[PDB]
Amino acid sequence: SGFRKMAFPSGKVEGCMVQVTCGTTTLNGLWLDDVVYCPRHVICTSEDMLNPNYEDLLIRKSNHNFLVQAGNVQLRVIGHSMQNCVLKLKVDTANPKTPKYKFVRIQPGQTFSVLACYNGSPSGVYQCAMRPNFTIKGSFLNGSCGSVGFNIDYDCVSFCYMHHMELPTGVHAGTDLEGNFYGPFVDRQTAQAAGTDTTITVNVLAWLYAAVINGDRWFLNRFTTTLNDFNLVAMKYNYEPLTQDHVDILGPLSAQTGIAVLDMCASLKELLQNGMNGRTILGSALLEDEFTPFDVVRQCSGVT
Amino acid sequence: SGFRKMAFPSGKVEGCMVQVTCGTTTLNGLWLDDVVYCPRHVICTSEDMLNPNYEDLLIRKSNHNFLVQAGNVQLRVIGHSMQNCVLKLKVDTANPKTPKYKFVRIQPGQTFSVLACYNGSPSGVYQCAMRPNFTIKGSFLNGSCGSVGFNIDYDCVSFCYMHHMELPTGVHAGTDLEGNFYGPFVDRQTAQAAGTDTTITVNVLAWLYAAVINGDRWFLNRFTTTLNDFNLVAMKYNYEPLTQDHVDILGPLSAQTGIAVLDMCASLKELLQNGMNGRTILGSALLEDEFTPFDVVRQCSGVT
């Protein structure tokens, strides 16, 4: 019993972290096989970040200008190329600690773990969600760029995020491992406002199921609703619309608890309309949306 | 910017996890050097747990009855001994992945990361606090016993907890790595009620400092208080009494923000007396107490 914001074990990713320095800028790189992946803004000074022409800045850079250090040993750079907003530095040595991996581009609402690093060294691990406005609410200081987000399925690491930017609002933006930013964000120090940060409804429902499994049941009511009625309430409270795809994904949780998805939606509707009245659910005083239905099943069954 | 419930990178601990089986019971073990540490209740059936005589049960066990598997390979057991509530199984092979380590017995209010494991395999990592009633609010299912709590200082892992029990209330109890339980708990399936779960006041203050650093300042007020006045309020709300030792530990946070500790206590006093009024602090609708002053400094400075 018990339910925690759990991150994936980070060891497989720790073995991939390296430090990349170009000129006076140092950030983190991801070493998989004989390629080091890092944000292209490693070639920028803070002044360049105001209005960078990455193609023009990259011309003035040769292989020997990219210093890559794994632990206390230097990797030899034998090629470099820019793919969207990431640089791929070909090194002469395959990373012996390379795990089985995939590059995946996640959808908003999906969760992942972040291994925060500085100077190629891991500082901590935490669980995040890609917000519906394509930002992440992370914990990143200067030098954390190049830290990555990932998911693990038995022995396969699916890298989904690479940290690049902090918006003026203190929220974070980055790319998938192909260098394409999530959302409309660009690797430029300019006004980039985020859109409405809506609540991930399917995740809140999954967390309510996790609460029922773990004993927190005070919020269960005698009511039911319909998808259209629930969605009128969801729109009012800046919750994402719930679809039949979401109901289907909640099927195993509905079956395990015996609570029909629409009955759980009716409990959620009352929690939105009446609030928690000073009560808590799984140790939280707000409706948690950073657990997917898959996370709840995984945690509640002990998948390793 | 941003503040997250961050766990230590778990790689160094992942390399120590093994599966231990004795008869029909399987749990996790910690392999450091040529010793495997695991809960002594590995020798129990669920029936034995009702009223176990560990010395008598252990007599019927020989080295060959303890099956230790690291990954997919079997470790040879050449000795066994019981130290308090843990078994120490001497193996013929030193763990090549043994990190620099120490065994530490933490105080209530101290935080640590837990690497939840099943069958010797890591499932996830999360950050915990030893509650003032010596329980932890974890996420542990059957087979999670032997999972460990730890802290890391650069390259040294300080193991502080080993999971043993789930109390009938769904909270968790365990030992330090010498096998001594935290609190009055015993490794027996019997009525073990926990005492009052008070709030770790020094940690809440540290988290309020973290909020100020990160931009959440609405709760700062025009008031101050004294340690005795604050403590009258703390007692009323089941908060731990604040001492001059706690004020001293909050000194660096007080200096960085320019907010005197007693002024922050006065903001906390008003938050206790008036509530949050539907507002949030660092994305939480309740006062968070699982960040020590050391955790706040570490996270806010990027210690690797």
Ligand SMILES: *CC(=O)N(CCC(N)=O)[C@H]1CCS(=O)(=O)C1
């Ligand atoms: C190195 C890095 O990730 N930066 C952001 C640091 C934080 N706090 O996320 C760096 C990239 C361009 S930037 O102007 O956002 C500063």
Ligand SMILES: *CC(=O)N(CCC(N)=O)[C@H]1CCS(=O)(=O)C1
């Ligand atoms: C294997 C283990 O840790 N147990 C507890 C499982 C949970 N949910 O923490 C196991 C040890 C004795 S017990 O009766 O608590 C069951």
